[PDB]
Design a protein around this ligand. Structure first.
Ligand SMILES: *[C@@H]1O[C@H](CO)[C@@H](O[C@@H]2O[C@H](CO)[C@@H](O)[C@H](O)[C@H]2NC(C)=O)[C@H](O)[C@H]1NC(C)=O
Ligand SMILES: *[C@@H]1O[C@H](CO)[C@@H](O[C@@H]2O[C@H](CO)[C@@H](O)[C@H](O)[C@H]2NC(C)=O)[C@H](O)[C@H]1NC(C)=O
Ligand SMILES: *[C@@H]1O[C@H](CO)[C@@H](O)[C@H](O)[C@H]1NC(C)=O
Ligand SMILES: *[C@@H]1O[C@H](CO)[C@@H](O)[C@H](O)[C@H]1NC(C)=O
Ligand SMILES: *[C@@H]1O[C@H](CO)[C@@H](O)[C@H](O)[C@H]1NC(C)=O
Ligand SMILES: *[C@@H]1O[C@H](CO)[C@@H](O)[C@H](O)[C@H]1NC(C)=O
Lengths: 152, 323, 316
């Protein structure tokens, strides 16, 4: 075995789902009953970039697909982007730290700090269609922590 | 005169360019019961200060000019205070018989517009994921009449609070809808109000800290004496014995862990032994204490003799070791 | 011009209330590039001639979206936006279905909102953005099965001027259908805008602190070059979830440092074994040799509730 990954679906604090629309972007909006399985499903896998009881390093990318999200500086400011990958190599441990996150999970609610940029988190606006993005502000106007449901 | 040294370590700190309201210490010479302070005996309350200097001075207050230091009722009143006010202060009581003076260093603190300051901030525990909690602007009391309606805004960092995802300003109170770890940080309310044709500021800041719910306050859980890991040691193996214990969070919680040779703080007969004591805290402030035992050669009696790890915190717990 | 694609969120609204189809993924109200605006018009799949204009006086086009107040049953259909930069052009469709305002049709309009039980949680009224561009902060009224929730109610708190309904401490009986109801105010017309929320409860997940069970200093050895190894962890109850059995000498990492291929650890074993219990096991194997003849080795088990470790003695 390479890396024990797992499929799941995240959904944020205000109940918004997580559907793709790019693949140059992701969005977080309310899915009607009859549209629920539009929401992307994630392949989360443990990379083990740095040990800590608090942080569990995890790289996650979209399953049945080749995308994996990673942080990069679009003009010296952290930006969330979807980089494609060789389906041959991945999933893999010790993954490039652009692709690495460390989930801070507490009582079933979990945040995702960036390894590349500490104190920068996967976030979402409270508006509806606005995209998922890397965020520098925690506990502000943008939603940082989500809740995941495992899937099959 | 009955005289108490200044409250050196019980110090006061005040923001510049905005009203203070200092009280004279009556926790010494207690004197407050069944209708507060007694001026009836005719014990005049005298004020006077000295500044960072070498001399005492009568306190000018009437032509300040704006009664800027007028004491309205058995207590001092700066509207507004000024950096030059820093220094030690004194109040005393006079009866033809009675005298009593005491001092307290008043350090005036400059303020950044981002609320940066040397001022000590009060930590304010807040239970995690509770339904809804809130915080009131700390020390607004008595600064202004019920008649006037104040404007009052809040700020996390220099970040003003508006459209926050789970925090909401509600007049004097700040409400946290589902207190998450994301909510840690220094907060600061800033209340404005008009008085005699002027706007005074009151900025005060406290740091919110999210902690474990009482919803999950539970007796300590013993981990190490699990028995699935069996501690057997043939004669003279320098055996070690760790006792890791998880504590749920409570405020008046005195977490205690101790080994029990059989009920008397070890070291019976020779029995040379010593404890190593580690500790860890969750982000939530959930302690997890640990203890261990360095050991010499194992005397024949040790194995068949039982000893046990212990812990208690508003609840009590116990676990049996194995050899 | 190109057809870019179908808009993911179809919209099953109710009859007799407003609707707003914003051109899919074309605008986001990000109207920075809007000076001399781009040509824009909608049209039905079957009905093309529309401006889209208006059947009666119902339909029109606000900033980037056409409305249907009231939206009528039969208005159901598919629509396509249009965009024109002489340098470009494309289109996208929003599906739409209007139902009758019968209680019977509710389960089809429902938004699934989830909350784990024995905790506080929040229900947000969905799809209200286009109409919430006013400062009378959201005058919504939450009903539960035709039961209006007043501040007198202790179980549910309606957040003042917001879309959130605070469930203070959710219980099994709290599952079911709810209703957002935004009273609108356009041109002086006051209209209801309903939203069916359906709450699903979930049980908080098991997560136990495991113990390790292979602490013995390698009792055996001889240089047979075959190295057997198990790190047995005890899960009180089956919860191989975030649980992770990472093997590292201590510093080495057992991978991309200690091996050029020399040493690695293959598959894993979630035994289950004894009925009630559940257990997991790794296997670091020096497939053909163990030569250096010295190493600190450490079994790392790690999940959200504990970072644990283990080391062992010299061997034979
Ligand atoms: C208020 O009183 C305190 C204590 O009397 C003063 O601090 C003293 O200052 C001298 C000269 O710098 C130091 O050598 C002493 O050690 C201090 N006393 C003590 C007990 O530490 C201080 O000057 C006064 N505060 C102000 C603002 O003047
Ligand atoms: C919230 O306030 C606390 C206390 O004022 C800040 O913690 C201080 O941070 C500095 C580092 O910049 C430490 O050297 C000090 O020891 C801390 N003060 C004390 C006494 O705890 C903290 O920086 C503030 N939080 C944030 C995120 O800005
Ligand atoms: C405050 O202190 C300065 C510096 O000694 C002094 O010059 C000034 O007179 C003081 N301010 C007032 C209002 O007297
Ligand atoms: C002055 O004050 C003291 C303190 O209570 C009191 O004992 C004494 O009687 C007073 N002298 C009078 C009566 O003026
Ligand atoms: C459309 O045309 C304008 C004007 O030439 C140009 O600035 C713009 O980049 C074009 N649109 C896009 C997205 O390229
Ligand atoms: C809005 O909803 C309420 C409650 O169901 C109802 O009484 C009222 O008739 C509705 N308003 C309009 C404009 O029909």
């Amino acid at each position: 075995a390479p890396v024990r990954s797992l499929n799941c679906t995240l959904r944020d604090s205000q109940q918004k789902s997580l559907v793709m629309s790019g693949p140059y972007e992701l969005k977080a909006l309310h899915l009607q009953g009859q549209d629920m399985e539009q929401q992307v499903v994630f392949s989360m896998s443990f990379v083990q970039g740095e040990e800590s009881n608090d942080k569990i390093p995890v790289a996650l990318g979209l399953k049945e697909k080749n995308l994996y999200l990673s942080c990069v500086l679009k003009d010296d400011k952290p930006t969330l982007q979807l980089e494609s990958v060789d389906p041959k190599n991945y999933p893999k441990k010790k993954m490039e730290k652009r692709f690495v996150f460390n989930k801070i999970e507490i009582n079933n609610k979990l945040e995702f700090e960036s390894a590349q940029f500490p104190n920068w988190y996967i976030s979402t606006s409270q508006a509806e269609n606005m995209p998922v993005f890397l965020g520098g502000t925690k506990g502000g106007q943008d939603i940082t922590d989500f809740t995941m449901q495992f899937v099959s | 005169c009955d005289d108490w040294g200044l409250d050196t370590m019980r110090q006061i700190q005040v923001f510049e360019d905005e009203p203070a309201r200092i009280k004279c210490p009556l926790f010494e010479h207690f004197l407050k019961f069944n209708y507060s302070t007694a001026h009836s005996a005719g014990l005049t309350l005298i004020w006077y200060w000295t500044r960072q200097d070498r001399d005492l001075e009568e306190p000018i207050n009437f032509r300040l000019p704006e009664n800027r230091i007028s004491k309205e009722k058995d207590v001092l009143w700066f509207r507004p205070t000024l950096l030059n006010d820093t220094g030690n202060y004194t109040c005393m009581l006079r009866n033809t018989t009675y005298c009593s003076k005491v001092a307290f260093p008043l350090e005036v603190v400059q303020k950044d517009s981002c609320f940066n300051s040397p001022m000590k901030l009060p930590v304010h525990k807040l239970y995690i994921e509770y339904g809804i909690q809130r915080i009131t602007c700390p020390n607004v009391d008595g600064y202004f009449p019920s008649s006037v309606k104040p404007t009052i805004t809040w700020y996390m960092g220099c970040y003003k609070i508006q459209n926050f995802n789970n925090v909401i300003p509600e007049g004097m109170n700040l409400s946290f809808l589902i207190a998450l770890i994301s909510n840690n940080g220094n907060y600061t309310c800033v209340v404005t109000y008009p008085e005699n044709g002027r706007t005074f500021h009151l900025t005060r800041t406290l740091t919110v800290k999210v902690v474990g719910s009482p919803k999950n306050a539970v007796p300590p859980v013993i981990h190490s004496p699990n028995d699935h890991v069996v501690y057997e040691k043939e004669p003279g193996e320098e055996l070690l014995i760790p006792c890791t214990v998880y504590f749920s969070f409570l405020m008046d919680s005195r977490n205690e862990v101790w080994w029990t040779i059989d009920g008397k703080k070890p070291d019976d007969i020779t029995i040379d032994v010593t404890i190593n004591e580690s500790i860890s805290h969750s982000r939530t402030e959930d302690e997890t204490r640990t203890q261990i035992l360095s050991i010499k050669k194992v005397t024949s009696e040790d194995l068949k003799r039982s000893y046990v790890c212990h812990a208690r915190s508003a609840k009590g717990e116990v676990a049996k070791a194995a050899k | 011009c190109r057809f870019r694609g179908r808009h993911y969120k179809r919209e099953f609204r109710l009859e007799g209330e407003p609707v707003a189809l914003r051109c899919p993924q074309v605008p986001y109200w990000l109207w920075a590039s809007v000076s001399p605006r781009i040509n824009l018009t909608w049209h039905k799949n079957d009905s093309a001639r529309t401006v889209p204009g208006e059947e009666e006086t119902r339909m029109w086009a606000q900033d980037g979206a056409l409305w249907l107040l009231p939206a009528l049953q039969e208005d159901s259909g598919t629509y396509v936006c249009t965009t024109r930069n002489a340098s470009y052009c494309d289109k996208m469709s929003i599906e739409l279905r209007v139902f009758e305002n019968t209680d019977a049709f509710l389960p089809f309009i429902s938004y699934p909102q989830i909350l784990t039980l024995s905790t506080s949680g929040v229900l947000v009224c969905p799809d209200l953005s286009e109409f919430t561009r006013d400062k009378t902060d959201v005058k919504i009224q939450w009903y539960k099965d035709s039961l209006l929730l007043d501040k007198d109610n202790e179980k549910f708190l309606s957040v003042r001027g917001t879309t959130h309904l605070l469930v203070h401490d959710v219980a099994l009986e709290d599952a079911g259908y709810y209703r957002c109801v935004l009273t609108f105010a356009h041109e002086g017309q006051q209209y209801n805008i309903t939203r069916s929320i359906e709450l699903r409860i979930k049980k908080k997940k098991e997560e136990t602190i495991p113990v390790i069970i292979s602490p013995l200093k390698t009792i055996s050895a001889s240089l047979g070059s075959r190295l057997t190894i198990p790190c047995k962890v005890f899960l009180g109850t089956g919860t191989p979830l975030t649980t992770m059995l990472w093997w590292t000498a201590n510093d080495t990492h057992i991978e991309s440092a200690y091996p050029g291929g020399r040493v690695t650890e293959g598959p894993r074993q979630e035994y289950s074994e004894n009925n009630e219990n559940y257990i997991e096991v790794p296997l670091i194997f020096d497939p053909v040799t163990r030569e250096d003849l010295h190493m600190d080795f450490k079994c790392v088990v790690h999940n959200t509730l504990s970072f644990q470790t283990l080391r062992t003695t010299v061997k034979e």
